[PDB]
Design a protein around this ligand. Structure first.
Ligand SMILES: [Zn+2]
Lengths: 175, 128, 134
RNA sequence: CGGUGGAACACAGUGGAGCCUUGUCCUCCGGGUUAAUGUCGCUUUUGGCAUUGGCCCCUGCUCCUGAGAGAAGAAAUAUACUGGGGAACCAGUCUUUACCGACCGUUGUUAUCAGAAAUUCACGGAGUUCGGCCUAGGUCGGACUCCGAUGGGAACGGCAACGGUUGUUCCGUUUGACUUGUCG
């Protein structure tokens, strides 16, 4: 006979607050320009995808770019899709973490729509890192990023004790 | 299949042990972050010690942790991986995370998506 | 070099607590060479004239808020010390203190067999078996 | 707590009986040199492989026993490995003029969940090599290597029992002095 027992397991008490993805609103005004630009890149030539706009869409290149090899470009922007199925969670629990230790001004934007499976199924993996140094795109990227799309850290900024979190999991026991 | 019994009388000794484990994890993480934000690796063999003692308490009470904690800490030297060495992907395998000591913690990520751990599934977990 | 130190965390902790004592002795020698009794001028003197010696020096001014607030708040949560004090239970509280760890505690030597050990306050960085480190 | 005064230097202290695998002058594995043979490439000849024969490879010290303490420069900084001790160091596995190394085998266990899997069952992916169909190199089978989110774990790792050592097992004393009794 099977009996269900609830076992107490210690939780990471700040992983919910460390994965508080930033507040994004009025987002369908942004995907139009972003998707139009990405498609206009992806149409002509795979070298002409990366000649006018320098973007990296492979996570090894994201780590090697944020390691400290290129330090000239200080405003660098990132776009990562959450709330989307068929997306790996091991990378997703480490993308907002690795950008925090980067000395460059890296601006993560979390895309909140669940139906946006296009950018993952089309380009590479569903993430986009590019540079706003002298491009035209920054002329609107600096417009909206102060409005709603602010990214700041409250969790490491001040000194605060954190309450413990002990959850409990299900376990079957056959006798 | 069986009997459905859901007890919310948490036991006092288990709460004491998990508060001890969580306090050791918090003080080790805050030592590591307060040292890492300011300057170079000053007392990085110190905070690791706490984690090691933490894992030894996990030997005594025979309790289990979420895979977030064991994914954060190491396996051999038992150090925090908040500042790892290198992260590589699609290098003819799945994934690799290198450390300073040389012990790596890799994950089979190139097989298929939508794979969750047993504590991260929809209904298997009840908070507090 | 760095890999051979942290092969065992205990031996690296021993090397760290030896290096802190050696750096403190070198700090006393450079402080007598400085001939300035003020410690706030002494730290800036070491920052100006001895960069590699300053790297392993402890920071007690940093050490107090990073430890005391977390320790006091953990004891206020664990021993159920709230605004209502008239529902306290001492025996279970002493049992919890027997079950709680002392790593990170402020503790004071009030009585000792040695007359020189008394009067020392300090915060735990590591608990040993039969000695104590503050 | 252990051993000696019973064993005479292993003469297993000696004798007898029973059984069998009938007590094999045997074999450590392993590594080096030399000689002979056969194959494959360079062509006085040399190199690689396999077999056979010969040699070489370590009683750390005292003591009958029990036990005691010395040092780990033939690869390290902490002086072989592992854990702790505040440090001389302690415990366990080991070796010691080792100018080569050597953690013996079998059985069971590591409950429940988790995970593909709790013992080199199996399964999934990648790379290499070989064979068949076949020839823009597609597929199939066999072998090796690496990895797979979990759990203290995947490490022939930890725990417990049993010796092949010079065949096993059983039985008996080599331990006495006076007093008394019997027998020659
Ligand atoms: Zn590590």
């Amino acid at each position: 006979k099977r009996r269900q027992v609830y076992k107490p397991v210690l939780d990471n008490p700040f992983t919910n607050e460390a994965h508080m993805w930033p507040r994004v609103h009025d987002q369908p005004l942004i995907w139009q320009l972003l998707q139009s630009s990405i498609i206009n890149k992806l149409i002509h030539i795979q070298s002409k995808e990366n000649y006018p706009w320098e973007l990296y869409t492979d996570f090894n290149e994201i780590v090697q770019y944020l390691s400290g090899a290129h330090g000239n470009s200080d405003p660098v922007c990132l776009f990562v899709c959450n709330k989307d199925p068929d997306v790996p969670l091991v990378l997703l629990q480490q993308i907002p973490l690795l950008c925090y230790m980067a000395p460059m001004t890296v601006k993560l934007v979390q895309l909140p729509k669940s139906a946006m499976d296009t950018f993952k199924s089309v380009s590479k993996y569903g993430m986009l890192l590019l540079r706003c140094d002298d491009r035209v795109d920054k002329k609107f990227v600096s417009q909206i990023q102060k409005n709603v799309d602010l990214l700041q850290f409250p969790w490491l900024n001040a000194i605060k004790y954190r309450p413990t979190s002990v959850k409990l999991l299900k376990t079957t026991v056959p006798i | 299949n069986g009997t459905l019994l859901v007890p919310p009388p948490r036991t006092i000794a288990n709460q004491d042990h998990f508060h001890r484990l969580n306090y050791l994890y918090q003080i080790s993480a805050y030592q590591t972050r307060a040292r890492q934000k300011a300057r170079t690796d000053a007392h990085t063999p110190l905070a690791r010690n706490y984690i090691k003692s933490m894992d030894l308490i996990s030997k005594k009470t025979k309790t289990s942790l979420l895979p977030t904690i064991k994914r954060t800490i190491c396996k051999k030297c038992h150090r925090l991986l908040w500042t790892p060495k290198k992260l590589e992907i699609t290098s003819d395998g799945a994934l690799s995370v290198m450390c300073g000591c040389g012990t790596v913690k890799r994950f089979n990520i190139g097989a298929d998506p939508n794979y969750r751990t047993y504590s991260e599934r929809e209904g298997n977990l009840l908070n507090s | 070099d760095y890999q051979r130190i942290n092969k065992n965390s205990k031996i690296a902790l021993r090397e760290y607590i030896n290096n802190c004592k050696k750096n403190t002795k070198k700090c006393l020698k450079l402080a007598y060479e400085n001939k300035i009794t003020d410690k706030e001028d002494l730290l800036h003197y070491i920052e100006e004239k001895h960069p590699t010696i300053y790297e392993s020096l402890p920071q007690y001014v940093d050490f107090v808020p990073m430890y005391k607030e977390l320790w006091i708040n953990y004891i206020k949560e664990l021993l159920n010390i709230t605004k209502n004090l008239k529902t306290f239970n001492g025996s279970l509280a002493l049992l919890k203190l027997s079950m709680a760890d002392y790593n990170g505690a402020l503790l004071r030597v009030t009585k000792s067999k040695n007359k020189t050990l008394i009067g020392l306050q300090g915060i735990v960085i590591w608990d040993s078996q039969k000695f104590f480190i503050m």
